[PDB]
């Protein structure tokens, strides 16, 4: 029976590939040949938020576009007031090895996780006046790569155990589990409508999930290496990826195939972070070579550089308002670019 | 008023400085090794789904943090980039067991890692007493698994433990030679390997780690001060 099922699998794969080939009657580069360039995007370090004792591994902006939570490997979360550099909170973590952090859309909670295989929800607004752990979500059999809030009640996380799960924070147990990746799930991005989310895995593929149906809708296999970062395009119909291949790819969910590749032969290091601009015309990307590059999402030609970091740029994000870009690095400093 | 928020930020900064004064005084060690080894016994003997396991011990009034990565997947390509900038990696192998080739491959993978090219390795060839018993019994020949042993001869620069069977010395030094050859043939200067023979009953592992870490930070400072 195994041989027959493998035959059927290869038949379906060939059919899918042929359909994608048939739908490729044009290219985004060909279509975008007429639009005017964006010129050169020069940005300068408006702020330098320092105080983390070790490598900064993750950061996330609040929906107010002013407060941002930052996580470091020494076991601290610091909620910064970016407008003034003030530190609102400094939360000591139980586990020093934190690899992700999130800021709830309402701003009431933050989450973090890492090699301890547990996602800890912290309650920022409490009568006692101090940040207190509200829930410790356990059940993953591997380190935690990413975590994003659908709401104050629900959080979706991805772990190195090749699984992604959706949690109900109130009861504290997995509502549903997503499976199918054959490697560590390294990044996770939530659709703007919060009905779908895409996760990249070390198996060099990205999958589109349905948070309520619990099944993958389609899979994308354009990369040749591990996918370290992923972000949705603002319209929600496309998403970009970053990999150890030292290149980015832009996939569209409706076309179900890659649209554009961003790479220069003079770049040889992997990509750690990715995020679009508010309009989506720019595609910032963090690199292991200590600097971040700005890519024109349509022309696909490099349009700038953000070089102010001493070490690896491990994290990066754009305000929902779109006024600024934050970039954390292993230098332990976090900088706001504008 | 915003001045109160500034004062709160200053208080948080003072707390962060008081925490940095503890962060910089602690030496962080990563404990690696296959399940057949005795790394669990080693960590237990440190008498001063959860994932990371941490053990703290003190020797000569310097604090050590020993992290054992218990519950993860078999592959470590990604989560090991976090353990960059640790003082040292404590690699443990069951020298009496042969699984030794898988241990050799694992040590080769750790040594030749992009993110661990400045991290010195402290190698504990654990369960040496079992190897000595195995050699004394002579039930199985190490040569079958490793053909090189048929022509290997113990060196003159050896430091044999008093009261040791010569064949045991040859076997243990050959096994040490495997790992030191792997280390020397692939990297130099940036990081070093410190082989050690040990047994679960031993109580000197803390002293071994302390001495090796002392030398490691000596070399780090020597590089920092442009003396090498």
């Amino acid at each position: 029976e195994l041989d027959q099922l493998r035959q059927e699998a290869e038949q379906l794969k060939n059919q899918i590939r042929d359909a994608r080939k048939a739908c490729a009657d044009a290219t985004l580069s060909q279509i975008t040949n007429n639009i005017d360039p964006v010129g050169r995007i020069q940005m300068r370090t408006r702020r330098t938020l320092r105080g983390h004792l070790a490598k900064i591994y993750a950061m996330h902006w609040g929906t107010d576009s002013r407060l941002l939570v930052s996580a470091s490997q020494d076991g601290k979360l610091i909620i910064w007031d970016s407008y003034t550099t003030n530190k609102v909170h400094a939360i000591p973590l139980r586990s020093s090895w934190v690899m992700t952090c999130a800021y709830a859309p309402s701003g009431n909670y933050v989450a973090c996780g890492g090699l301890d295989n547990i996602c800890s929800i912290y309650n920022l607004k409490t009568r006692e006046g101090n940040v207190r752990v509200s829930r410790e979500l356990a059940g993953h059999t591997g380190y935690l790569s990413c975590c994003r809030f659908l709401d104050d009640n629900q959080i979706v996380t991805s772990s190195g155990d090749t699984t992604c799960a959706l949690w109900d924070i109130e009861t504290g147990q997995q509502t549903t589990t997503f499976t199918g990746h054959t490697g560590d799930v390294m990044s996770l991005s939530l659709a703007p409508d919060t009905r779908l989310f895409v996760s990249g895995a070390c198996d060099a593929s990205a999958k589109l999930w349905d948070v309520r149906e619990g099944m993958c809708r389609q899979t994308f296999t354009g990369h040749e290496s591990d996918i370290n970062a992923i972000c949705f395009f603002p319209n929600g119909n496309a998403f970009a990826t970053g990999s150890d291949d030292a290149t980015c790819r832009l996939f569209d969910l409706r076309a179900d195939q890659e649209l554009m590749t961003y790479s220069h032969d003079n770049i040889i290091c992997g990509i750690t972070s990715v995020s679009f601009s508010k309009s989506g015309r720019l595609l910032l990307a963090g690199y292991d070579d200590f600097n971040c590059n700005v890519w024109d999402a349509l022309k696909a030609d490099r349009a700038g550089v953000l070089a102010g970091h001493d070490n690896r740029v491990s994290c990066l994000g754009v305000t929902d308002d779109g006024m600024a870009v934050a970039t954390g690095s292993w230098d332990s400093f976090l900088k706001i670019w504008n | 008023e915003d001045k109160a928020a500034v004062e709160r930020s200053k208080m948080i900064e003072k707390q962060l400085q008081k925490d940095k004064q503890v962060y910089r005084r602690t030496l962080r060690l990563l404990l690696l090794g296959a399940d057949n080894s005795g790394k669990s016994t080693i960590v237990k003997q440190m008498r001063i789904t959860s994932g990371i396991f941490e053990t703290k011990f003190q020797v000569d009034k310097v604090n050590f943090h020993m992290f054992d990565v218990g519950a993860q997947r078999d592959e470590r390509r990604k989560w090991i980039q976090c353990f960059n900038d640790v003082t040292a990696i404590i690699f443990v192998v069951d020298s009496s067991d042969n699984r030794l080739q898988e241990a050799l491959n694992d040590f080769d993978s750790i040594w030749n890692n992009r993110w661990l090219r400045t991290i010195s390795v402290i190698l504990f060839l654990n369960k040496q007493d079992l190897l000595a018993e195995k050699v004394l019994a002579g039930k199985s020949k190490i040569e079958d698994y490793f053909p090189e042993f048929a022509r290997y001869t113990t060196p003159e620069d050896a430091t044999p433990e008093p009261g040791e069977d010569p064949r045991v010395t040859r076997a243990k030094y050959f096994i040490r030679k495997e790992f030191v050859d792997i280390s020397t043939a692939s990297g130099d200067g940036r990081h070093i390997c410190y082989p050690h023979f040990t047994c679960a009953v031993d109580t000197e592992n803390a002293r071994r780690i302390f001495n090796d870490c002392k030398d490691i930070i000596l070399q780090m400072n020597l590089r920092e001060y442009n003396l090498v």
Epitope: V88, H89, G129, N130 | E1, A4, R8
Partner: single-chain antibody
């Protein structure tokens, strides 16, 4: 969360007495504390303030140099020491909790208060002394300020408080638009930066009390007494 004061004994003019506050149920270390007095049958007046960590201390000119405020953070106790009590000092003294950071809601919780019986700054005015009302109808309370409380940061540092008969004041609105925790959505606030209005959409008998407006750019308004 509880703030209970102590003291309030009889004092002859020219005497001295120390009031104390015991804080429990919250992290007293990171809260700035205020002393707010209330003379018999009239409005509130701000007495003193000590920031978290005791880094900043302020007094009203009515008591500057005559009172002294101290906090014993390890024991979660706050003290107000008075050296020379005058007849003017007779008033009920509340202790008010306040934490300052972006988005916080200072002045949120007030203590129980104790009666101490003894034998230029911003001018905040509420012209209306009282307003007859009935349950189910909307009512508006207004106030004026000498300076425009709208700071260059965009925030309008105007606070509203309600004191029910026989209770300590409760925070309604902070910075002119933000409802405090536990306040029903029936209350709302607005202002132009120099004139402000507080509105209750639908009144209930539990809303009867005296409404005070305070600026934090700390003077209190004369108060408005809603009656039914």
């Amino acid at each position: 969360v509880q703030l209970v004061e102590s003291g309030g004994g009889l004092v002859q003019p020219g005497g001295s007495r120390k009031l104390s506050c015991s804080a429990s149920g919250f992290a007293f270390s990171s809260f700035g504390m205020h002393w707010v007095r209330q003379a018999p049958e009239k409005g509130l007046e701000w007495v003193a303030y000590i920031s978290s960590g005791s880094g900043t201390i302020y007094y009203a000119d009515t008591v500057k140099g005559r009172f002294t405020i101290s906090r014993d953070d390890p024991k979660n106790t706050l003290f107000l020491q008075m050296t020379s009590l005058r007849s003017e000092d007779t008033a009920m003294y509340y202790c008010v909790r306040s934490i300052y950071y972006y988005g916080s809601s200072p002045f949120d919780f007030w203590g129980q208060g104790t009666t101490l019986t003894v034998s230029s700054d911003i001018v905040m005015t509420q012209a209306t002394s009282s307003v007859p009302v009935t349950p189910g109808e909307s009512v508006s309370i207004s106030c004026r300020s000498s300076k425009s409380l709208l700071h260059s940061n965009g925030n309008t540092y105007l606070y509203w408080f309600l004191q029910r008969p026989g209770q300590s004041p409760q925070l309604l609105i902070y910075r002119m638009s933000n409802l405090a925790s536990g306040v029903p959505d029936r209350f709302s606030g607005s202002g132009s930066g120099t004139a402000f209005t507080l509105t209750i959409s639908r009144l209930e008998a539990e809303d009867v009390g005296v409404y005070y407006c305070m600026q934090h750019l700390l003077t209190f308004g004369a108060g408005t007494k809603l009656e039914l």
